[PDB]
């Protein structure tokens, strides 16, 4: 123990590496990109049955064309979501158009850098890295449907599919087998739900899991519980015959 932005002898930033450990303790979040949209799904993980399950907001809208799922210390995501919404709305104000998904992600990632004990910048207004990863999914005319993983390192990666949180190692393997460049939106929905069922340390129902997507034509929508339950009936029945 010595400082915040210190390097290890292996050339990694201690605090950035430890924030990653915090994310591994988080609830699972999975995203799947297709040519008909991007689906985002999360594990609620209520700590008690008295917790009102739909007060758990781990999937948030950023703009009509951009959505977000989070994993780790979810309280740290509030000021990231806020910064992303302002960046998207401001862009529309300055440019009379939608921000690109990649540009929005880069801005959130720029925010992520701003940690350090009054460090030599301009100016670091943050004492530690965020303890939260984000999956940012959306659509823009140029590059179509897109999924991004934004770490508190300030790095972001594009993905066809990605899982973050406690069940991510197992989830990612299943995503490698199941993903192909011709998945429909409905197939993607079933696949997220399926993999979530595998890694949830409860039995997946409409109250402990939440689905969402973004399509060009209808924007980012969160699925309400009734629509989710129908897919959970549909998954179990699809996975009986086979």
């Amino acid at each position: 123990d010595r400082g915040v932005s210190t390097f290890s002898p292996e050339g990694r930033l201690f605090q950035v590496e430890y924030s990653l450990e915090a994310i591994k303790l988080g609830s699972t979040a999975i995203g799947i990109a297709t040519k008909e949209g991007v689906v985002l799904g999360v594990e609620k993980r209520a700590t008690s049955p008295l917790l009102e399950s739909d007060s758990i907001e781990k999937i948030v809208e950023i703009d009509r064309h951009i959505g977000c799922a989070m994993s780790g210390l979810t309280a740290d995501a509030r000021s990231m979501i806020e910064h992303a919404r302002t960046a998207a709305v401001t862009h529309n104000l300055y440019y009379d158009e939608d921000i690109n998904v990649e540009s929005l992600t880069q801005s959130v990632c720029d925010l992520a850098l701003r940690f350090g004990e009054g460090a030599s910048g301009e100016e670091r207004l943050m004492s530690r890295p965020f303890g939260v990863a984000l999956l940012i999914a959306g659509h823009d005319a140029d590059d179509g449907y897109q999924l991004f993983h934004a770490e508190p390192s300030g790095t972001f990666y594009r993905y066809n599919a990605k899982a973050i949180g406690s069940g991510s190692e197992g989830a990612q393997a299943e995503l490698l087998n199941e993903w192909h460049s011709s998945l429909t939106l409905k197939e993607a929905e079933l696949l997220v739900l399926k993999i979530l069922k595998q890694v949830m340390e409860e039995k997946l129902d409409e109250n402990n899991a939440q689905l969402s997507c973004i399509t060009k034509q209808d924007g980012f929508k969160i699925y309400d519980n009734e629509k989710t339950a129908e897919l959970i009936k549909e998954l179990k029945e699809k996975e009986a015959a086979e």
């Binding site: 010595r2 400082g3 932005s5 210190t6 390097f7 290890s8 002898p9 292996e10 050339g11 990694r12 930033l13 990632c109 720029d110 850098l113 350090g116 004990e117 009054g118 460090a119 030599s120 993983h149 390192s153 300030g154 790095t155 990666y157 594009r158 993905y159 066809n160 599919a161 990605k162 990612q172 995503l175 490698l176 993903w179």
Partner: protein, 233 residues
């Protein structure tokens, strides 16, 4: 002796070493490989990108700075964004105020000075990224190597990152051939692509694997990815 002396950048060890800087340099040795080389008419960057998964994008390693300048990175990528951003402004200031394209050498000196401050200020950290800078200015083509220690050197060719030595060795021997590839862009790229291959246990560089950048006499700095690099594999 190696104990309390790696706490911050503001502390020398009894040997005269700055360990935090040595550790920053180490983030490079872990970064994906990238190659720089130039003739007298063009300068080329070749960068093997690294993916996280088979489902992920090979994260981009070449950043444009002006119409005549650009760079490739190895190590902490966000640090390459801070530095290239600064270079973009410096090139921009040179244009607006003086109607003058910024010399690659000045760009080198500016990056050095910027990196230096962070090796001396308390509470800050050294940059954790190496950069290869190419440009074409009023004195021809140039390649620069930037180290986070703040050391910049001008070279005919070089390579940084994991197993860069193979490519650096190959370039030391190919010297007299490649420096003569004038007015022939595709052969300079070719020389760079075969230079990077001497550094691959990995695999065979694929279409989404490869990134190429060129600048030269009547050629603004431009980046090639995927479809446009297929002819070089």
């Amino acid at each position: 002796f190696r104990n309390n002396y790696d706490g911050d950048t503001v502390t020398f060890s009894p040997t005269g070493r700055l360990f935090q800087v040595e550790y920053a340099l180490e983030a490079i040795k872990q970064g994906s490989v990238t190659v720089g080389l130039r003739s007298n008419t063009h300068a080329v960057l070749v960068a093997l990108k690294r993916n996280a998964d088979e489902l992920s994008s090979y994260q981009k390693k070449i950043i444009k700075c002006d119409e005549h300048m650009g760079l490739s990175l190895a190590g902490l990528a966000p640090d390459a964004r801070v530095l290239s951003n600064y270079l973009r402004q410096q090139c921009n200031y040179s244009s607006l105020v003086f109607n003058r394209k910024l010399a690659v050498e000045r760009a080198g000196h500016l990056l050095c000075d910027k990196a230096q401050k962070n090796t001396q200020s308390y509470g800050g950290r050294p940059y954790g990224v190496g950069l290869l800078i190419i440009g074409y200015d009023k004195s021809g083509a140039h390649l620069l190597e930037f180290q986070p220690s703040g050391n910049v050197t001008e070279l005919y060719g070089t390579a940084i990152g994991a197993r860069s030595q193979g490519a650096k060795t190959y370039l030391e021997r190919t010297l007299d051939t490649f420096i003569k590839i004038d007015g022939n862009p595709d052969e300079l790229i070719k020389a760079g692509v075969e230079a990077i291959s001497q550094s691959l246990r990995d695999e065979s560089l694929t279409v989404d694997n490869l990134s190429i950048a060129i600048v030269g006499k009547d050629t603004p700095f431009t980046i090639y990815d995927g479809e446009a690099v297929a002819k070089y594999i």
